[PDB]
Design an enzyme around this catalytic site. Structure first.
Site, mmCIF file in Angstrom:
data_model
loop_
_atom_site.group_PDB
_atom_site.id
_atom_site.type_symbol
_atom_site.label_atom_id
_atom_site.label_comp_id
_atom_site.label_asym_id
_atom_site.label_seq_id
_atom_site.Cartn_x
_atom_site.Cartn_y
_atom_site.Cartn_z
ATOM 1 N N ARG A 14 4.096 0.505 2.549
ATOM 2 C CA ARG A 14 4.120 -0.441 3.539
ATOM 3 C C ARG A 14 3.860 -1.990 2.496
ATOM 4 N NH1 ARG A 14 2.274 -3.930 7.541
ATOM 5 N NH2 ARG A 14 -0.094 -3.590 7.202
ATOM 6 N N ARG A 46 -5.676 5.624 0.695
ATOM 7 C CA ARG A 46 -4.671 4.328 0.726
ATOM 8 C C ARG A 46 -5.046 3.757 -0.492
ATOM 9 N NH1 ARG A 46 -2.888 2.967 5.696
ATOM 10 N NH2 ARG A 46 -2.391 5.258 6.975
ATOM 11 N N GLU A 78 -1.879 -3.896 12.915
ATOM 12 C CA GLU A 78 -1.074 -3.511 14.147
ATOM 13 C C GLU A 78 -2.093 -3.545 15.378
ATOM 14 O OE1 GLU A 78 -0.308 0.721 13.454
ATOM 15 O OE2 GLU A 78 -2.169 1.274 13.125
ATOM 16 N N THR A 84 4.901 8.372 10.475
ATOM 17 C CA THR A 84 5.724 6.780 9.949
ATOM 18 C C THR A 84 5.231 6.526 8.787
ATOM 19 O OG1 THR A 84 3.683 5.596 10.507
ATOM 20 C CG2 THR A 84 5.282 5.891 12.200
ATOM 21 N N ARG A 142 3.265 -7.310 12.580
ATOM 22 C CA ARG A 142 1.910 -6.928 13.229
ATOM 23 C C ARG A 142 1.355 -8.220 13.204
ATOM 24 N NH1 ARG A 142 0.332 -1.182 10.322
ATOM 25 N NH2 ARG A 142 2.294 -0.236 10.579
ATOM 26 N N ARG A 184 0.997 -1.208 0.020
ATOM 27 C CA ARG A 184 -0.014 0.193 0.071
ATOM 28 C C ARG A 184 0.787 1.283 -0.153
ATOM 29 N NH1 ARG A 184 1.716 3.238 4.756
ATOM 30 N NH2 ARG A 184 1.092 2.154 6.232
ATOM 31 N N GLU A 204 -7.250 6.830 7.973
ATOM 32 C CA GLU A 204 -5.908 7.372 8.593
ATOM 33 C C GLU A 204 -5.809 8.346 7.567
ATOM 34 O OE1 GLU A 204 -3.333 5.304 10.457
ATOM 35 O OE2 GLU A 204 -1.773 6.752 10.042
ATOM 36 N N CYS A 256 0.248 10.480 9.949
ATOM 37 C CA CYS A 256 1.295 10.026 10.717
ATOM 38 C C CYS A 256 2.790 10.097 10.091
ATOM 39 C CB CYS A 256 1.012 8.504 11.141
ATOM 40 S SG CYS A 256 2.281 7.683 12.195
HETATM 41 N N1 ADP Z 1 -0.022 -9.251 3.255
HETATM 42 C C1 ADP Z 1 -1.296 -8.888 3.767
HETATM 43 N N2 ADP Z 1 -2.419 -9.664 3.147
HETATM 44 C C2 ADP Z 1 -3.473 -9.802 3.773
HETATM 45 N N3 ADP Z 1 -4.003 -8.463 4.394
HETATM 46 C C3 ADP Z 1 -3.162 -7.609 5.101
HETATM 47 C C4 ADP Z 1 -1.685 -7.807 4.495
HETATM 48 N N4 ADP Z 1 -1.168 -6.894 5.129
HETATM 49 C C5 ADP Z 1 -1.901 -6.209 5.843
HETATM 50 N N5 ADP Z 1 -3.123 -6.699 5.731
HETATM 51 C C6 ADP Z 1 -4.392 -6.180 6.211
HETATM 52 O O1 ADP Z 1 -4.374 -4.737 6.096
HETATM 53 C C7 ADP Z 1 -5.456 -4.241 6.980
HETATM 54 C C8 ADP Z 1 -4.845 -2.917 7.682
HETATM 55 O O2 ADP Z 1 -3.896 -3.107 8.387
HETATM 56 P P1 ADP Z 1 -2.869 -2.112 9.239
HETATM 57 O O3 ADP Z 1 -2.012 -2.784 10.071
HETATM 58 O O4 ADP Z 1 -3.846 -1.043 9.738
HETATM 59 O O5 ADP Z 1 -1.938 -1.509 7.781
HETATM 60 P P2 ADP Z 1 -2.153 -0.338 6.794
HETATM 61 O O6 ADP Z 1 -3.207 0.721 7.366
HETATM 62 O O7 ADP Z 1 -0.902 -0.139 6.669
HETATM 63 O O8 ADP Z 1 -2.692 -1.120 5.431
HETATM 64 C C9 ADP Z 1 -5.733 -5.306 8.103
HETATM 65 O O9 ADP Z 1 -7.085 -5.613 7.616
HETATM 66 C C10 ADP Z 1 -4.781 -6.392 7.510
HETATM 67 O O10 ADP Z 1 -5.285 -7.873 8.138
HETATM 68 N N1 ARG Z 2 -1.321 3.370 11.740
HETATM 69 C C1 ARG Z 2 -0.164 4.017 11.998
HETATM 70 N N2 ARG Z 2 0.150 5.307 12.052
HETATM 71 N N3 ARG Z 2 0.623 3.329 12.970
HETATM 72 C C2 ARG Z 2 1.880 3.863 13.509
HETATM 73 C C3 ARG Z 2 1.520 4.805 14.723
HETATM 74 C C4 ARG Z 2 0.369 4.220 15.539
HETATM 75 C C5 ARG Z 2 0.022 5.042 16.858
HETATM 76 N N4 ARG Z 2 -0.247 6.415 16.721
HETATM 77 C C6 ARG Z 2 1.547 4.775 17.720
HETATM 78 O O1 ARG Z 2 2.261 5.833 17.892
HETATM 79 O O2 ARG Z 2 1.594 3.533 18.146
HETATM 80 MG MG MG Z 3 -3.689 1.229 9.456
#
Ligand code: ADP
Ligand code: ARG
Ligand code: MG
Length: 356
Positions: free
Chosen positions: A280, A229, A314, A273, A309, A126, A225, A271
């Site tokens: 990611r 995305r 996370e 990060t 995670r 993503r 967020e 964020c």
């Molecule tokens: N490799 C992957 N395969 C399937 N689902 C994933 C994978 N990586 C993350 N996810 C899914 O992404 C969603 C968001 O997770 P999160 O940790 O909030 O990451 P982000 O916001 O960076 O996408 C969750 O539903 C999680 O299960």
């Molecule tokens: N979705 C995110 N931005 N994760 C990273 C930071 C998450 C949360 N604010 C922390 O400080 O632990």
């Molecule tokens: Mg997220």
């Protein structure tokens, strides 16, 4: 700048942070008394104060980071706090460094990290994007949420090929489908406590939604967020196809939606990060020998700049031993480098798993 009420809350929050003996957030580490006294009276043009930056980390002492940017200006006005936190998190991104120019690079070179499928269940990459002319969640109005959603949905409707799909707003969405999309790892959670404390879920669910193709290999989250995305994912290990599809999506979408970029910080996100490449790249992966203690896996993953995670994202646990493992850093390296760092790390962990 900040008024009496905000200053009172800030003084209290600083004391709470100092008093939190078990807190290890980057916020607590870098909000020294000196930095605090320097920043506490400041306020951006939109009216964001130091409270709007740090409140999530004051409320959630177990935060890893603990701050967000309520508007783009906040990165600059409160740079004495953002800068060292950014350097710590992204390893080696120094106070005067500039994030490199966008480069997806040699997309062709990425491999299938697990053809047989004994380890990797699914692969996902993503990016995040902010729309020009709009601040981040704490400063968005209800009108803006809806306006942004209208722009995004109308825009994505012109996408074709594998990107062709449908916008599904959260407003009116079947509750059953919503929870299944979340359980199936496609749709964002309805906020969390970190986002709540950052005033990042205001007016929920207005302006929030998900676009996706029918086979759910390409998806766009709207107004979680970040404004956007942009997500590519599929079952199996084909990081190459996943990243190829993401790159195409990003390129097509920016032709239709102007995004906020910064000369030092790269693409802007809510964020710190998620700045820079905003990339990611992750696998859902089973590593039963290595992952007997989450701690031992985290040690080993950390050595490769990987982050671990849970299965639902996370702050969740691994279910059925499925861990989410991804590149931790996003700034100070190119988009190509970020995905390559993930790929190299995953392959190393598979080698370690096999050999122990
Ligand atoms: N490799 C992957 N395969 C399937 N689902 C994933 C994978 N990586 C993350 N996810 C899914 O992404 C969603 C968001 O997770 P999160 O940790 O909030 O990451 P982000 O916001 O960076 O996408 C969750 O539903 C999680 O299960
Ligand atoms: N979705 C995110 N931005 N994760 C990273 C930071 C998450 C949360 N604010 C922390 O400080 O632990
Ligand atoms: Mg997220």
């Amino acid at each position: 700048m900040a008024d009496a009420a905000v200053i009172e809350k800030l003084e209290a929050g600083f004391k709470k942070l100092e008093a939190a003996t078990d807190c290890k957030s980057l916020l607590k580490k870098y909000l020294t008394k000196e930095v605090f006294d320097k920043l506490k009276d400041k306020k951006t043009s939109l009216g964001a104060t130091l409270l709007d930056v740090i409140q999530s980390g004051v409320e959630n002492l177990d935060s890893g980071v603990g701050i967000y940017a309520p508007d783009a200006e906040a990165y600059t006005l409160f740079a004495p706090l953002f800068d060292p936190i950014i350097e710590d998190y992204h390893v080696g991104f120094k106070q005067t460094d500039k994030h490199p120019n966008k480069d997806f690079g040699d997309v062709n070179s990425f491999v299938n990290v697990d053809p047989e499928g004994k380890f990797v269940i699914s692969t996902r990459v993503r990016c995040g994007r902010s729309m020009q002319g709009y601040p981040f969640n704490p400063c968005l109005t209800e009108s803006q949420y809806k306006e942004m959603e209208a722009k995004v949905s109308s825009t994505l409707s012109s996408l074709e090929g594998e990107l062709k799909g449908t916008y599904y707003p959260l407003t009116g969405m079947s509750k059953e489908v919503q929870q299944k999309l979340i359980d199936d790892h496609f749709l964002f959670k309805e906020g969390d406590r970190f986002l709540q404390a950052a005033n990042s879920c205001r007016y929920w669910p207005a302006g929030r939604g998900i676009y996706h193709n029918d086979n759910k290999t390409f998806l766009v989250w709207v107004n979680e967020e970040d404004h956007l995305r942009i997500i590519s994912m599929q079952m199996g290990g084909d990081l190459g196809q996943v990243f190829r599809r993401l790159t195409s999506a990003v390129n097509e979408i920016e032709k239709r939606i102007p995004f906020s970029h910064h000369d030092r910080l790269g693409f802007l996100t809510f964020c710190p990060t998620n700045l820079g490449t905003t990339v990611r790249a992750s696998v859902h992966i089973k590593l039963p020998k290595l992952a007997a203690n989450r701690e031992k896996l985290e040690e080993v993953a950390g050595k490769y700049n990987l982050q671990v995670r849970g299965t639902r994202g996370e702050h969740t646990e691994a279910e059925g031993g499925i861990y989410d493992i991804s590149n931790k850093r996003r700034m100070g390296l190119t988009e190509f480098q970020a995905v390559k760092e993930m790929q190299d790390g995953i392959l190393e962990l598979i080698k370690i798993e096999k050999e122990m």
